[PDB]
Paper text:
Here, an alternative approach is described for the purification of antibodies utilizing an engineered binding protein based on the archaebacterial Sac7d scaffold in combination with light‐controlled α‐CD affinity chromatography (Excitography). Affitins offer certain benefits as antibody mimetics due to their small size and robust fold, comprising a single polypeptide chain of just 66 amino acids, which forms five β‐strands and a C‐terminal α‐helix, while lacking disulfide bridges and posttranslational modifications. Starting from a published affitin molecule, a monomeric protein version (C3A24) was engineered by substituting the unpaired thiol side chain Cys24 within the binding site by Ala, and, unexpectedly, its binding activity towards the human IgG1 Fc region was even improved (K D = 76 nM). X‐ray analysis of the cocrystallized C3A24 with a recombinant human Fc fragment revealed a 2:1 stoichiometry, with a binding site at the junction between the CH2 and CH3 domains.
In the present crystal structure, the homodimeric Fc fragment appeared tightly associated with two molecules of the optimized affitin C3A24, which both bind to the linker region connecting its CH2 and CH3 domains. The symmetry‐related interface of each affitin molecule is formed by three β‐strands (β3, β4, and β5), consistent with the positional randomization strategy that led to the selection of Sac7d‐C3 —and also in agreement with some previously published or crystallized affitins directed against PulD, CelD, or lysozyme as well as the green fluorescent protein, GFP. Surprisingly, it appeared that the affitin binding site almost entirely overlaps with those of protein A, protein G, and FcRn. Overall, the interaction between the affitin and the Fc fragment is stabilized by a network of hydrogen bonds that arise from six residues in the engineered binding protein. Among those, Tyr40 makes the most significant contributions: both its backbone carbonyl oxygen and amide nitrogen form hydrogen bonds with the side chain carboxamide group of Asn315 in recFc, while its phenolic hydroxyl group forms a hydrogen bond with the main chain amide group of His435. On the other hand, the C‐terminal residues of C3A24 are involved in dense contacts with recFc. In the present case, however, Lys65 of C3A24 forms two hydrogen bonds, one via its main chain carbonyl oxygen with the ε‐amino group of Lys248 in the Fc fragment and another one via its ε‐amino group with the backbone carbonyl oxygen of Asn434 there. Furthermore, it seems that the tentatively modeled residue Lys66, despite its low electron density, contributes a salt bridge via its C‐terminal carboxylate group with the ε‐amino group of Lys248 in recFc. Indeed, the small Ala side chain snugly fits between the two nearest residues in recFc, Ile253, and Ser254.
Numbering used by the authors:
A (entry chain C), B (entry chain D), C (entry chain B), D (entry chain A): 236 to 444
E (entry chain R), F (entry chain T), G (entry chain S), H (entry chain U): -2 to 66
The structure:
Amino acid sequence: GGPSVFLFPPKPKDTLMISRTPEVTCVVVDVSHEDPEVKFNWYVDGVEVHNAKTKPREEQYNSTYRVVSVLTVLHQDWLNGKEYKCKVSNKALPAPIEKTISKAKGQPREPQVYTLPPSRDELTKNQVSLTCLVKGFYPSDIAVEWESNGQPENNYKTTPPVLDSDGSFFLYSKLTVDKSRWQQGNVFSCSVMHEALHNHYTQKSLSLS
Amino acid sequence: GGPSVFLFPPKPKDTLMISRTPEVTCVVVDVSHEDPEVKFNWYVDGVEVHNAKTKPREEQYNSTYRVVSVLTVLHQDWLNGKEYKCKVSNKALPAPIEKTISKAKGQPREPQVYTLPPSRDELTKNQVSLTCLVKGFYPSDIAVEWESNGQPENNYKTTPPVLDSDGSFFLYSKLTVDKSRWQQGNVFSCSVMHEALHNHYTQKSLSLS
Amino acid sequence: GGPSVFLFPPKPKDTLMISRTPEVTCVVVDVSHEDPEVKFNWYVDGVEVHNAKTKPREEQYNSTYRVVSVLTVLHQDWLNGKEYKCKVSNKALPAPIEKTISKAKGQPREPQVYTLPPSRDELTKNQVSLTCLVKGFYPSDIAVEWESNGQPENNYKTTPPVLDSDGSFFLYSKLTVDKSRWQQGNVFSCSVMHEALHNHYTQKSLSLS
Amino acid sequence: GGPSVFLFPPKPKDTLMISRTPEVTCVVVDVSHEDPEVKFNWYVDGVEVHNAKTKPREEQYNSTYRVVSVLTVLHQDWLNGKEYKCKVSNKALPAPIEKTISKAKGQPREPQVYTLPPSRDELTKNQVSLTCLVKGFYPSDIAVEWESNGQPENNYKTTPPVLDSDGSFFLYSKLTVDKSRWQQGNVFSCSVMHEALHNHYTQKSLSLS
Amino acid sequence: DAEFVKVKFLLNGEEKEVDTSKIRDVARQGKNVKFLYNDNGKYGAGNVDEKDAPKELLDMLARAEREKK
Amino acid sequence: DAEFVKVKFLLNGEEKEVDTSKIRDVARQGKNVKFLYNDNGKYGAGNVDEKDAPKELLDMLARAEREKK
Amino acid sequence: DAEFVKVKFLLNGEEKEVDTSKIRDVARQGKNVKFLYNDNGKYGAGNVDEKDAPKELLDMLARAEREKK
Amino acid sequence: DAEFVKVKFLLNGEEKEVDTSKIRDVARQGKNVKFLYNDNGKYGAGNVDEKDAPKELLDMLARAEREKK
């Protein structure tokens, strides 16, 4: 072929907060300096749209480029499950590339958020693992953050969502904290944001008591 | 664009048990009726090996084929980090394709296995979520099963491994069980198998207390 | 559902002074003389607690009773935002009642206490209005009293708290005093007690100069 | 326990301005799919009236509906203290429901409107609090807005009315404004509208100097 | 400046008349001026064509369009 | 008591109206309050000038500026 | 610009210790001085026999008996 | 520590010998016991007839048939 094309959905937090701008992003890699003309056409359920923006060409070691279009979308469009197509049209590729992206079809389902304390056995360590289970939610698009005493706690990782036996999703998030802090008796909180939550937002707390 | 080649590692449980046969699998896709003959050559650190087998051709959409070679390997070869090359030779491709696969480089690290009981909040439900955290292990190749009363419990899902901030891996596994059973006071066990464990095997149990 | 149930938080001053006993109070009204047994179960984050006290029946003209349970709590439990459930179990209704109460979640915020003198126009009256503004505090639970010359002044009313545009609270308190007293030049003081104040206590004064 | 019925008075500013339309609103909640049809009859001192309108059904989380009737009323009827009954008739209820609403009984009393400038201590901040006290008025139904340079100032909050020791009402209103503006020397006004005011309207002003 | 001008109007065909000073609010609907009034203690409403309106009532109306809004 | 406060707004010139309880997020842009809502299963957005915004919507907005972030 | 003082006490048999500046209220019950404190954002309570109470804690207690009441 | 059983076996005809404690898995193939081991850091495999097997290796095998499976 020649080049290569990727299409990314908006950040889960950006479709849930009217304060923010969600975007669909088209990324095209391995575009030839011999004819670096890339054309983008954006479609929202067929209908062409001319509000996209293409960040200027950007080259790597190989002097092959990487060009990115950014289609800002409406929260409610995405969430009502509209479809975003990008027609990418280079020279190198025999025929233009058509990719489509959209939210997952199916009745939305509310997450159940449960925090779990460290295992007894883990207490022999210096750092301990504060756990949060998010279960039974649909679709998978979700945000998850941690905080304590009105400040972000950033030393966590969250698993990808996992398809459950009932066709919902679950994940776990894991915040790591010096056993000192857990043991004094401070309070930690897991914020979850999902379309199926009232206020697109819920929170659950966890402490040594 | 021509065909395409992929190369898959053995099942984690097959490299840890001398009772079983680990295999590396080469998958070649988008092989056409125009040139359907594919040739396979297998190398273990350069050295050609003649114990592979090629499962018969199979068709996809596009009336393209998909051909699969299966190289049974030695436990200790894989685990000592030997390299498995497959030279795939179709006519369609200007030059034969060479792909190499091998166990992940790096000092092995022992998994820490901790079981977590259901959240109090979850107890209001019919089913409850028995959780197992596996943390700080390398490489990511791992097996995880559940059982009770010396019999398999099959109603669980395990997350993918997740790269931690120290470059080790963690995952969570989640067994779901009728709250009746949890509340009676039965015992559930999570079996974990990894190269870095004594006996390639460890187990941790969980019960209502 | 014949009876009716209410659940009251502790008095704001009782959670801030270790000298005092805070309590959560469950009030059940319209309980039948035919079916007069009421059962109370108290939970502090799930955990059952057996220190409650139920004041004896109190019957009205209506020949319905009103029964009241009193769960004394710990200052720090309430303030750290623990949750107090009461399971009320009525014979009359075939469905027990579950109510939960707890302090308001969110980063605590310190009140700003400003006293305002009477309007010039108000001076044409016999009694005048000494005003105190309390602003920018969280959560809303607060105490506010007045005094002069080391003695309580009880001729005041305080507004409910009001949610401000920044998500904090404000209220006003109004002490009324014979214009004589304001004009002689006595000093009046507004005491405010809140969790976010040093010493859970502050005071601001006001006089004709 | 079948449905339930609530009955809301007209907006205070709508009963005081002949240019506007006051309305009494009947809200009926907990109507189910099992029997989803509710009937309304409106009475103004007994006399049936057929100018009401019933907004369509609306369903909630509980799969119960909520239906709302809207009876436009006459200024002078409401203000002369006529009584508005709504007979709500579901089959579910053993007998139709009768609720009555009307202006608060008692000799009307004129509000005293006094503006208070910011506390000296508040001047250290970026925003300052312009205060208005409204005192000694009856009944509690009242309107309060702020403005400057003949234009609405919208960054204010007003407390609920509060029952005073003499059985009248008071409230406070609080407009917040950048200290810049207060300090330049602009003029702010608090407009109060009440039945007991000449012209149903009065205004009081406030400025730095 | 004790003003006390009267506004004559028709109520249920009967020709009522109320003092200006008992009028609480005025509003215009084309050439028709409505007005809410408080007579001795009871509240009533009344119409008048603009031609039949005293200028004091129209002065009141202007003042109110400015003030009330 | 527990009201049903409705927020009136303009959509493509059509004057829509939505209950507060169907509103999932609110935000302010100058004098202009935006809000995302979920009406019986479809998601929609809506504007209102702050002057035309009910207390409850502004309460929601404040609560969100505190909480969501 | 100066000194600080720690109060040692027993919590679930564990020997905790808290600074005076984190103490929000103090009170006496016989020979026993209770105190509510706020350690970096969590609230806790603590006892001490009067004999084992530092001067500063007893100063705090007196000041509070005067002020709070 | 407190096992140190050695298992002697043949590798490419050469007579190797490895500690029990370096054995990660055992498995039986008739009267032939295979075993995977980890010697210092490198992995190897080895056979032995059951007659030539120390009882500790056969104990390991039983334990593993139960556990791993």
